[PDB]
Amino acid sequence: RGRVPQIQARQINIFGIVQGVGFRPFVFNIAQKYNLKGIVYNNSSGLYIEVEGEEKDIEAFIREIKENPPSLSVIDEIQVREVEVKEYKDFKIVGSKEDGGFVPVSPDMGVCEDCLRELKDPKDRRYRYPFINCTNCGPRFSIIEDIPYDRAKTSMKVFPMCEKCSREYHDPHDRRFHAQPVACFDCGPSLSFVGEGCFDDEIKCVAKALKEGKIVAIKGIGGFHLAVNALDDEAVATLRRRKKRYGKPFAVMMRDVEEVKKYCIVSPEEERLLLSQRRPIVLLKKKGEKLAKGIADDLDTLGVMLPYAPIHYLLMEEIDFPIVMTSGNVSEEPICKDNEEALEKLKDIADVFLLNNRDIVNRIDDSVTSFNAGAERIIRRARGYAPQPILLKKEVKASILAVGGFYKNTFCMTKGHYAFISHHIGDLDNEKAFNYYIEQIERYKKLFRVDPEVVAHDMHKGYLSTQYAKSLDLPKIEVQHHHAHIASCMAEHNLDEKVIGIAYDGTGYGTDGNVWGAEILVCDLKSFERIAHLKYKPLPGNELAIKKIYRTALGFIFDNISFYKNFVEQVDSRELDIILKQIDRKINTAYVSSMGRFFDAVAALIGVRKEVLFEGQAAMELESLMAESEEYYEYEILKEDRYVIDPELILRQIYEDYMKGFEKSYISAKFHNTVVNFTYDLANLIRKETGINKVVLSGGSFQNRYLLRRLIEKLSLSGFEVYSNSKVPCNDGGISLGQAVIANKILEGSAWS
């Protein structure tokens, strides 16, 4: 009697990052709330739900999912179907099913506020538990072997739950209800300290070593890192000597935003990036108090991160100083991920070790990011970001592997509407880096069920990535480097039309046998036209000039030597003769149009540096010292087949300023403004010719905050719609995404079968 129940059934599939986020317990709880019966389980394509009940209750259930999905979920699609009623008697979370699809994998996540409260609560049984996590935080990618996500397919598979954790797991009122990684002191991983004898707890042993000025190798989420007191001058010097990493700045971990603000300017948008559970290193302008010498000498920025694992919060209560965190490897080798590996490879580097017995399946570096010109500008996309895919507007024609470049390598694999760009792999410069690259390609193919049908690669035949591409038994598409930079940005912004592409970087292989890197293109995703570039200058020695930048300067001034007397006289007389003869005789000489080399020529000419320890160092120092000015240098654009600007004419005025006694800061500002001004002028010329109003800025020179912001502002004020990289780097870390979407566009055209 009364209202007759009307029972309906719906099948619901949810796609995206929808596993390892506590979606199963969430669904269970809202299904109970709305008196629905049925089942939920992880399948190979995401999340599968069957619910039966009143239509009104099903609708409210769906609305709850849409309105407040789990915190770590990144839902891309929800499918809802009417199905027949089975007369389920209850609602249950059931076993996972492998049905042959594929599903995205969550990045590793920083400790949530609930776990942090429990960690610091002396009455909680997880008080000071170094591996505390829950459905809303902790390692994911780093410990996942396979999908559908479940404890048995993670390195927690060798840590069976104790009776207490199992009770929590099976208790619908517990916040760890069906939490796949649930563990505790009794059943979970443990720390292991190796050094000298210490009778204190492991974290305290680490704190003491750090206070004594020693180097600690710490097993973290993505691999090992080496730490020292960032206020300790000699400790930092010792770390640099032992790692053999002498120039590149060190990132530092600080306890909280309050501490960071003592050393850095922190905007609200930068504060948001720091505090994100993604927990990257964020590049921040220095202000106020100073860290030790040898952290970031001659730069105006510091790379800062906050604690991201429970061990960091524990360590922070024991020390009163920020710490260097640099990856645990000898310079130029992949980050160590295994205990045995670390103890062997870091034996002459670290003084003591903080190990643990939770296997790292997939090693991954810290991410490096920033906020500039109204958006996040990522530099190194790794822990906390990768392996989250870039969303494509349309499903792909077929799966493509894009092999990436040489510097800062990533590869990218497409499937469905995702571009799975890999985490940062590193400079593909040696056998160890290459072996690691190769293994990551195999692991991403397995993890995401990708079987590449076509391989995309750079035109540069010397990249190990290119050699790898050619080694495969697949059709190949070659992609010009600068075209790929522009396409990487187009991909993020769903652009698929001809844009004005400003591709500024150090070196990319051009189609005319020369080095490119200061190019203006008109391109879409399937072609490019080169419209403008810098007048080619000889670069004697090729790889030698990368680090001996006075050689780059000599190349830029080769045909007007007598003008730069003071500079040329500083070069050793015999070496000078040889360099000039080599240029003249075309011995080991490349011809370059390059914003990176232009920057190096300026830095050398005004005596910033004559030699550099790492690629781009001189350009970073030049940017860091710049003054506040609107002044700039005269330039000339000559139009023949293409528009060309001669950088040497600008170098003449720079050297004139230098001889007169102008401050380096002022000269740098004038130089930066000149590049902005001529680039703007070229863009306007091109718009007048073509009607094109979209401008894309990419290539590693746009890591320069000033160039990027000023050009975006100036172009925007003149009506352009301006785009630059945000989710992937404008440096070579982003190249694989551009290669992927270019090759994909070609596949769907008439010029491919």
Ligand X SMILES: Nc1ncnc2c1ncn2[C@@H]1O[C@H](COP(=O)(O)CP(=O)(O)O)[C@@H](O)[C@H]1O
Ligand Y SMILES: Nc1ncnc2c1ncn2[C@@H]1O[C@H](COP(=O)(O)CP(=O)(O)OP(=O)(O)O)[C@@H](O)[C@H]1O
Q: Which of 368, 402, 602, 707 binds ligand Y (CB under 6 A)?
A: 368
Three-class HEC string of 343-378: HHHCCCCCCEEEEECCCCCCCCCCCEECEECCEECC
Q: Provide CB contacts within 8 A for 496, sequence distance 6+.
A: 393, 490, 524, 525, 745
Q: How far is the CB of 534 from Fe ion (least distance, A)?
A: 15
371 is an interface residue for ligand Y by CB under 6 A:
no
Toward Zn ion, which CB reaches closer, 7 or 162? 162
Q: Which tokens in the block code for residue 144? A: 């996942």
Task: Please report, as residue ranges, which positions from 32 to 91 form the binding site for ligand X (by CB under 6 A).
Answer: none
Among the listed residues 17, 16, 140, 27, the one whose alpha carbon sits nearest the alpha carbon of residue 94:
27
Q: How far is the CB of 219 from ligand X (least distance, A)?
A: 30
Q: Which of 384, 387, 506, 538 binds ligand X (CB under 6 A)?
A: 506
- Total Cβ atoms within 10 A of residue 99: 10
Residue 134 interface partner, choices ligand X, Zn ion, ligand Y, none, CB cut-off 5-8 Å depending on type: Zn ion
732 is an interface residue for Fe ion by CB under 5 A:
yes
The angle subtended at Cα 563 by Cα 562 and Cα 569, nearest 5°, is: 60
Q: How far is the CB of 302 from ligand X (least distance, A)?
A: 15
Residue 327 interface partner, choices ligand X, Mg ion, Fe ion, none, CB cut-off 5-8 Å depending on type: Mg ion
Residue 525 interface partner, choices Fe ion, ligand Y, ligand X, none, CB cut-off 5-8 Å depending on type: none
104 is an interface residue for ligand Y by CB under 6 A:
no
Q: Which stretch binds Fe ion (CB under 5 A): 6-14, 24-32, 508-516, 620-628?
A: 508-516
The answer to whether residues 523 and 501 touch, using CB atoms and an 8 Å cutoff, is yes
Q: Is the dihedral of CA 359, 130, 140, 249 positive or negative?
A: negative
Toward ligand Y, which CB reaches closer, 296 or 447? 296
The answer to whether residues 595 and 603 touch, using CB atoms and an 8 Å cutoff, is no
State phi, psi for 728 to the nearest 5 degrees. Answer: -125, 160
- What are the angstrom distances between the C-alpha of 283 and each of 132, 255, 303? 28, 16, 4
Q: Which of 249, 280, 510, 647 binds ligand Y (CB under 6 A)?
A: 249
Q: What is the full DSSP assignment across 55-75?
A: HHHHHHHHHHHHHS--TT-EE
User: Scanning the structure block, which residue is given the tokens 């990535």?
Assistant: 465
Toward Fe ion, which CB reaches closer, 367 or 701? 701
The 3-state DSSP composition of the chain as helix, strand, coil percent (nearest 5) reads 35, 20, 45
* Binding-site annotation: residue ranges for Mg(2+): 327, 365
Cα–Cα distance between 454 and 401 in angstroms, integer? Answer: 6
Residue 184 interface partner, choices Zn ion, ligand X, Mg ion, none, CB cut-off 5-8 Å depending on type: Zn ion
The answer to whether residues 338 and 219 touch, using CB atoms and an 8 Å cutoff, is no
Per the annotation, the verdict on 255 as an active-site residue is: no
Toward Fe ion, which CB reaches closer, 118 or 505? 505
Cα–Cα distance between 403 and 407 in angstroms, integer? Answer: 12
Q: Which of 41, 308, 444, 599 binds ligand X (CB under 6 A)?
A: 599
Toward Fe ion, which CB reaches closer, 407 or 678? 407
Among the listed residues 17, 25, 140, 141, the one whose alpha carbon sits nearest the alpha carbon of residue 76:
17
Toward Fe ion, which CB reaches closer, 108 or 505? 505
Task: Please report, as residue ranges, which positions from 302 to 341 form the binding site for Mg ion (by CB under 5 A).
Answer: 327
- What are the angstrom distances between the C-alpha of 372 and each of 48, 284, 351, 404? 40, 10, 39, 25
DSSP state at residue 539 = E
Q: How far is the CB of 334 from Mg ion (least distance, A)?
A: 9
Cα–Cα distance between 605 and 601 in angstroms, integer? Answer: 6
Q: Mask 218-247, x = binds ligand Y (CB under 6 A)?
A: ---------------------------x--
Indicate which residue of 1, 3, 10, 24 is catalytic. 24
Give residues in contact with Zn ion (CB under 5 A): 112, 115, 134, 136-137, 162, 165, 184, 186-187
3-state secondary structure (DSSP) of residue 199 = coil
Determine if residue 289 is left, alpha or beta; phi over 0 gives left, psi from -120 to 50 gives alpha, anything else beta: beta
Q: 592-627: b or e for each residue (b if 16 or more CB lie within 10 Å)? A: bbbbbbbbbbbbbbbebbbebeebbbbbbbbbbbbe
The answer to whether residues 506 and 735 touch, using CB atoms and an 8 Å cutoff, is no
Indicate which residue of 1, 3, 13, 42 is catalytic. 42
Toward ligand Y, which CB reaches closer, 130 or 222? 222
The answer to whether residues 162 and 378 touch, using CB atoms and an 8 Å cutoff, is no
181 is an interface residue for ligand Y by CB under 6 A:
no
Per the annotation, the verdict on 329 as an active-site residue is: no
- What are the angstrom distances between the C-alpha of 91 and each of 33, 42, 255? 11, 15, 44
Q: Kindly determine how many residues on this chain lie close enough to bind ligand Y according to the rule CB under 6 A.
A: 18
Element (H, E) at 9: strand 8-17
Q: Which stretch binds Fe ion (CB under 5 A): 351-359, 447-455, 622-630, 727-735?
A: 727-735
Q: Kindly determine how many residues on this chain lie close enough to bind ligand X according to the rule CB under 6 A.
A: 21
505 is an interface residue for Fe ion by CB under 5 A:
yes
426 is an interface residue for ligand X by CB under 6 A:
no
619 is an interface residue for ligand X by CB under 6 A:
yes
Task: Please report, as residue ranges, which positions from 60 to 79 form the binding site for Mg ion (by CB under 5 A).
Answer: none
731 is an interface residue for ligand Y by CB under 6 A:
no
Q: Which of 38, 188, 294, 508 binds ligand X (CB under 6 A)?
A: 508
C-alpha 280: how far from its chain's center? Answer: 9
Query: How far from each other are the two terminal CA atoms of the chain, in whole angstroms?
Result: 67
State phi, psi for 665 to the nearest 5 degrees. Answer: -60, -45
What residue is closest to ligand X based on CB?
700
Q: Mask 674-713, x = binds Fe ion (CB under 5 A)?
A: ----------------------------------------
User: Scanning the structure block, which residue is given the tokens 């999908």?
Assistant: 147
501 is an interface residue for ligand X by CB under 6 A:
no
510 is an interface residue for ligand X by CB under 6 A:
no
Task: Please report, as residue ranges, which positions from 392 to 411 form the binding site for ligand X (by CB under 6 A).
Answer: 407-408
Residue 322 interface partner, choices ligand Y, Mg ion, Fe ion, none, CB cut-off 5-8 Å depending on type: none
What residue is closest to Fe ion based on CB?
505
Q: Kindly determine how many residues on this chain lie close enough to bind Fe ion according to the rule CB under 5 A.
A: 3
130 is an interface residue for ligand X by CB under 6 A:
no
- What are the angstrom distances between the C-alpha of 580 and each of 507, 556, 576, 590, 597? 22, 11, 6, 14, 18
Residue 724 interface partner, choices Zn ion, ligand X, Mg ion, none, CB cut-off 5-8 Å depending on type: none
Task: Please report, as residue ranges, which positions from 548 to 607 form the binding site for ligand Y (by CB under 6 A).
Answer: none
Q: Which tokens in the block code for residue 510? A: 């051009």
Q: How far is the CB of 264 from ligand X (least distance, A)?
A: 18
Among the listed residues 504, 624, 608, the one whose alpha carbon sits nearest the alpha carbon of residue 553:
608
Toward ligand X, which CB reaches closer, 44 or 701? 701
302 is an interface residue for ligand Y by CB under 6 A:
yes
Q: Which stretch binds ligand Y (CB under 6 A): 177-185, 198-206, 299-307, 731-739?
A: 299-307
507 is an interface residue for ligand X by CB under 6 A:
yes
250 is an interface residue for ligand Y by CB under 6 A:
yes
Residue 407 interface partner, choices Zn ion, ligand X, ligand Y, none, CB cut-off 5-8 Å depending on type: ligand X
621 is an interface residue for ligand X by CB under 6 A:
no
Residues tagged active-site: 24, 42
Per CB under 6 A, residues contacting ligand Y are: 245, 248-251, 281, 283, 296, 299, 301-303, 326-327, 329, 331-332, 368
Per CB under 6 A, residues contacting ligand X are: 407-408, 505-508, 517, 596, 599, 615-616, 619-620, 623, 699-701, 703-704, 731-732
Per CB under 5 A, residues contacting Fe ion are: 505, 508, 732
